[PDB]
């Protein structure tokens, strides 16, 4: 058969061919190798109206009959109808102008928020609303040791079919694949995540993989999915990451050493439960770091190039709640009302930066975490005020509003003065709540700042900050100031 | 000074005779790097490498899902070189940094999207439930297979983007490509070949050869072992490449220049219309193929539109490409500058009124460089040569009309059919105007809206065939009908 | 019961002096479109919702101002 | 009304405004184009602004007030 | 049908058993292709995901006739071609 | 080449040298009938005629005699008969 195929393909023509055999499999194996436009098995001259025909090689090109034949006699025209008809509506046209603001965005917040004392049993009815009966709890070893996933399992009762606790801090594609395999072998139709931002993002990726199949690396795209994914319920255990209401999930690619993104409105969790029990036992360091991460989210959202009044309101309310309630939590660790207020502030900060997008501070924090395994909250907190001063001149009256939210009096002052006062208030709160303030404490060497700055420019968070980053020479300056 | 080598058979090698040439920065006329000059022997070597990689390599035999993982690795290694690709593009082709900083990200996103579509949604096997023949019962179905060795020729307009387009469309469908970049801008193709080598793409799948003159191109087009030619450039060179390829009956796809018309209706928003017209005419100094160099403006809004257009055009800044404050850079070469000057002189001779520009620009702090001021011509009739011949420069002609039918007649009165644009306050009116335009792409209240799944191509003498989307992917596969 | 806390049910507030019932669930799924010249976005919003035959509901006073005409022109062929 | 889940309809046979209250009757989308309010007269402008202010102030005071609703009400009051 | 078959047999040399089906085949092809064009051919096609997040809007494909076509046929199968 | 000067779309359908492959497990009667038909329909003036007949060595002797007899059984005469 191989010799027959070699002889048949040994020609300059590719019009047609035929194979006669007593086995369909053998005939098709011979036929799939023939370089001809038409192959007949146990027949010849089998003309058809919807069967395209044509030649390979020097037998010509193009087809006749069928949709393939009909497509030869039509042109293809692409028509684009712009959603906006105003100046400055497209970021692409901002290249030929000095103004870089792009305020045209669409706002949405479909997540069902459940909060209050003893609101965990509501998950039993939320499962019925979503039409799911087989939930698998996704968590990690640290959270599983505290017994909160046991509480979630008891609340779910018969709607829980498994628990996966192997999610690691700074999860990767293989972690997502293993979690998805474990969820699939249990026959899950919904995912419940109990943990920090890493757990929630891994659960978003797991939901995408479960819905579409394949591997995690296949789905790393922006706004590609067109339909809702597997239902997801997020139960945060940190006083802020915002991931329970955002549309972005960050996953590390160990074969590349770079954090990759999946960004889609359809990966937003369907619901979230803000039970104060899940943050009542949080230690002091985690509390202050997550509160400062939420504050960084709210402040950056208030300053980015895509800031909108709705996002401004969310950011200001979150800033006010954090400023009022963080000292209460630090002084009175099991104050339940302050914990609930911090949870709500985190949710609203997540809502804010979901649309307004983060700036340079998160671009720096992501590289710090990817290279030196530094936690997200500490990195965001230590660079928030230096970024504030970095953007103090291109930020307008937004920083004055932030300062007023923090409490600094701005009955009259220049925009520079109010912007500096806001950073002074942020530093005052940071020092009041026992927050680390320098990179030298966490072991980053002085010389690696050049490599960190070079790795910083590769993130997508740039070009969303108020001040355009000219290059690594300014990232160097901010990193050195943070040392 | 950096040195670059040809990428043949999965490795970087020098030319057979060891000859090299030097590239030059159009922004300051300083040498950038030395690149190996491929001869006919190197072209033959590339052709045999691609032929072996197709006939006996594992690339065409593996499933689309198996190709998808390799394409994902390729896209990741492409993202890893974003800054280097942007810097090389700015220094070699004159792209401003604000424009050139997105090339690697766009190419990687395109690679991933097309790989996912091929692996998940492309109809590799299609059934024929009703064949139309009752005398031949059996199963009829369609198999789609790679063509073979593909040759992709790209111009100097958008080197990185066009190289990404050619490479993705060729290798994602299972073919093997030999890429020949423009003489002026060869660096970006080699940098992308570096990522191709790093990602572990099988040898012979991607080959890049750079050579001056036209012997290498003729050898590529007339060789019997090449199955398809995908050419982008001017109409005159494409019409000759098609004649050369006619002797062996091989598939040819042509993407030629255009004289795209931008139509402003009387109900359009003047601020948005002016911004869009300025962008679509002066992006990359008017060296984009789909540039709207013909600006059709209604008579009811001509006076208000002209002053705003003049102010917006004079607000543009021309400077060094690597400076982030620059909006416009230099032209690609001195010959292009001389061509633009000649066309401006011709337009002045024909009686058109010079509104702005029409002279060279001296960038402060820089000696040398092919800088030209953006130019606007008014009082232009549609039968003037400047309104009929492509320029490839920052020159625009403004033509006034009285009605939508007259605007459509003026827009269709050309030998090119690449693209077009309509600005109006009503979607229905804009679509009524757009459905009559004989162009491959129409933008309503926008311009240069590129897309990964949006096909683009030319009507008339702007070429034939499409790129991107399923329409673009279908150009690189054969159709086989199997009857059991 | 969805809640296991004191004061979670308005019915039990009859036998107490405190009438606050803070236990509610928040949602805001509406897609907000805003800005200068954002009306043409309805053409794409119709495609997102999977609809092709829209009927404009208005009144005489608004119809006299010509805004429904603008909406109809934005919808183009999606208005019946 | 473009984001609320309640619709009030008069019942002429009873002479009483009846209600339909459901999260599924919330509009899927809304367009905030300033053209649709640029020509609004003075009386309508002030009355609608005061209606929005009344909404925000009452929401900040009701028995079911929540911090998210408080933030919305305060931002609306500030903007008005 | 009969006139076409007789003319084909006398002009191109087709045997009558082969040439007697040409008109029926041509009419069936015409009807089938017309029905497919009117009912199933994608004259308008949507692009739900354009791959560009910086240019929101509706993208779709229109398919239009090319223009004047020239068809040259050989002497093998005149009526069918 | 002529149409290249104006850049117009061209579709080419040229001749062929189509090969007909008979494997060793094929039914000899059906294979012989199909080969004879696909080679001698319309005196071999069809574009897709299988003028190259690839026959396996394991069945060559049995196939050749049947092919010869089937070919000699053909009648050549007036088209209208």
Residue numbers in the entry:
A (entry chain D): 404 to 886
B (entry chain C): 1 to 484
C (entry chain A): 485 to 564
D (entry chain A): 646 to 725
E (entry chain D): 82 to 162
F (entry chain D): 243 to 323
Give sentences copied directly from the paper behind this entry.
In addition, a BN-PAGE for BdhE resulted in a single band around the molecular weight of tetramers (391.6 kDa). Therefore, BdhE was suggested to form a complex, but it is not polymer like AdhE but a stable tetramer. The results revealed that BdhE formed a ring-shaped tetramer, while AdhE formed a helical polymer, even though they were purified in the same condition. Looking into the cross-section of the BdhE tetramer’s electron density, we found that the tunnels where substrate passes were connected between ALDH and ADH domains. We found a gap in the tunnel wall formed by a BdhE dimer, which were not found in AdhE dimers. In an AdhE dimer, the linker of ALDH and ADH domains filled the gap, while the linker of BdhE formed the elongated loop (loop 2 in Fig. 4a and b) and thereby remained the gap. In BdhE, however, another BdhE dimer partially filled the gap in the tunnel wall within the tetrameric complex, suggesting that the tetrameric structure is more effective at preventing intermediate aldehydes from leaking out than the dimeric structure. Importantly, the RMSF reductions were significantly larger for BdhE tetramerization than AdhE hexamerization. The ring structure of BdhE is thus suggested to confer more rigid enzymatic activity than AdhE against environmental changes (e.g., salinity, pH, or temperature).
